[model samples]
Target: GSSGSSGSTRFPGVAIYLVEPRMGRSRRAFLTGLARSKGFRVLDACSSEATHVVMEETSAEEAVSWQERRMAAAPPGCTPPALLDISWLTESLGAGQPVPVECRHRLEVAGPRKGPLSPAWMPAYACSGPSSG
Candidate 1:
């Protein structure tokens, strides 16, 4: 259920890099499978070439700190990838919508925290598409 060519598609002009992703088993499986199908490209790892970056953060504090470090290392005025909570993956996928930008304070990142959300929103993990090979 991972990789591309079917089931999932990329969002035009939006490419995301996973920087030490800390998502849950379910979330990871979902994003991995739906990666290229819906409308986004979730890269396996970080690359300055990607337009957006994704990180697994548990708290707002951690996100802020990471953001600061990211800015320092990133090109001047470069818009770093949003620091998303694992919940972002679960919630966005459930709605069958594109991954969202989760924002808070200076911790602006992709995906929203709206309720009626599910932690186990994705279907069972099974590779039915392209492989990372």
Candidate 2:
């Protein structure tokens, strides 16, 4: 059966941030309106509350780089938001609720640096779990 409702908070604890670098303003607005109509929280700017960073026509590497730069300035203890493609949003919207993020939805950050870099400098957040001995 089909359901009809507007502004029904079906998906809670999900704040979406749309990357506008390559997606363009109009498309972003369209997606934003659709998401809000489906009761999904859409952020105007990259905020700590955003749980998903959705982008289109962009490489995963570029998205990761952008996320790293933003995370650098994030407040301490902030959770790292998921980097995703527009497909995820579309699928979730079609389902009429937030869908579980899968490999297909994930934007896999390619290429690891030569070394681990300063591991000791990594923040000790609750989500990271206790440091391994």
Candidate 3:
């Protein structure tokens, strides 16, 4: 594969959603992890809340562990509560294996849809170069 100097890429208002692992992990644990993120929070996971409230329901307290900021343009209305991403923690930091450009580096964000939500792995976070942000 070929790579180029793309610089740090900034998403306007992407919510990094994480998912739970398949090896008998708890969903609540994943949600709690989201609660501790820089720009994420916990909302009703029952999937029965009014659509108008989901937008402002996420945690946005600016945790000291992450450098990414809460997006101002993210929708301010109700959104489905599912998985959150934590991949940013590893990918942006340039640790672990090289994340595939066709997936984490591009539009594919499946971590939020299936695994446990945690720091450094949010689907919303991305990296172009080291410390690009």
Candidate 4:
């Protein structure tokens, strides 16, 4: 981790992409501006030149499986594209906070191939508990 003193560790022209949990244009525009302010070149997820990807949450099972297949097909010694959680990036940039490296997901390294959860946790959004109302 590096210091977050306004301009520290700014990567000029570095390519970055975005994935789910925060999809669509409005958010994309905001996040793109944020990255651009830090001198990163924001690209759509389909871009091959993406150096890092900022994900809002763990991806869907189909997407993760796609990623695994891509990783398995890439040549040896090619660096796996890093996946960054938005919460961490925001805090690291704004508050100089740090979380353990093990908590971060680097492609071909972390997360289950079919995604990060079990079917038992279905119905993704829960507003109230069984005891409520």
Best by TM-score: 2
Ordered from best to worst lDDT, the candidate numbers read 2, 1, 4, 3
Worst 10 residues of 3 by lDDT: 50-59
lDDT of each: 0.58, 0.81, 0.31, 0.56
Please provide, for model 1 over 1-133, each residue's C-alpha lDDT reduced to its tens digit, 9 standing for 90 to 100.
Answer: 6753544454646775554445655666566667555556676655555655445655665665666766677787677666565466556557666565645323444564666856765667843776685
Q: Which candidate is the best by lDDT?
A: 2
How displaced is residue 90 in candidate 4, in Å? 0.9
Q: Between 1 and 2, whose lDDT is larger?
A: 2
Q: Estimate each model's TM-score.
A: 0.52, 0.72, 0.22, 0.49
lDDT of 4 by residue, 15-105 (tens): 6677644455678787777756655666755444665666675543333554564467676666655565566557544743333333444
Kindly provide the TM-score of model 1 when superposed on the true structure, using C-alpha atoms.
0.52
User: What C-alpha RMSD separates each model from the true structure?
Assistant: 20.3, 14.0, 22.8, 11.7
Output the TM-score of candidate 4: 0.49
**10 residues in a row with least lDDT, candidate 2:** 121-130
- TM-score order of candidates, top first: 2, 1, 4, 3
Q: Which RMSD does model 1 reach against the true structure?
A: 20.3
Give one digit per residue, the lDDT tens place, for model 3 in 14-130: 323332222114654543354334233323332223111111112222121121222232345544322212443334224422233222222212223467777875475564556
Instruction: List pairs with backbone clashes in candidate 4.
Output: none
* Segments in model 4 whose C-alpha atoms lie over 4 Å from true places: 1-10, 20-22, 59-63, 69-79, 95-133
Alpha-carbon shift of residue 34 in model 4 (angstroms): 1.7
lDDT of 2 by residue, 38-82 (tens): 779888977898899888866767777778967798998998898
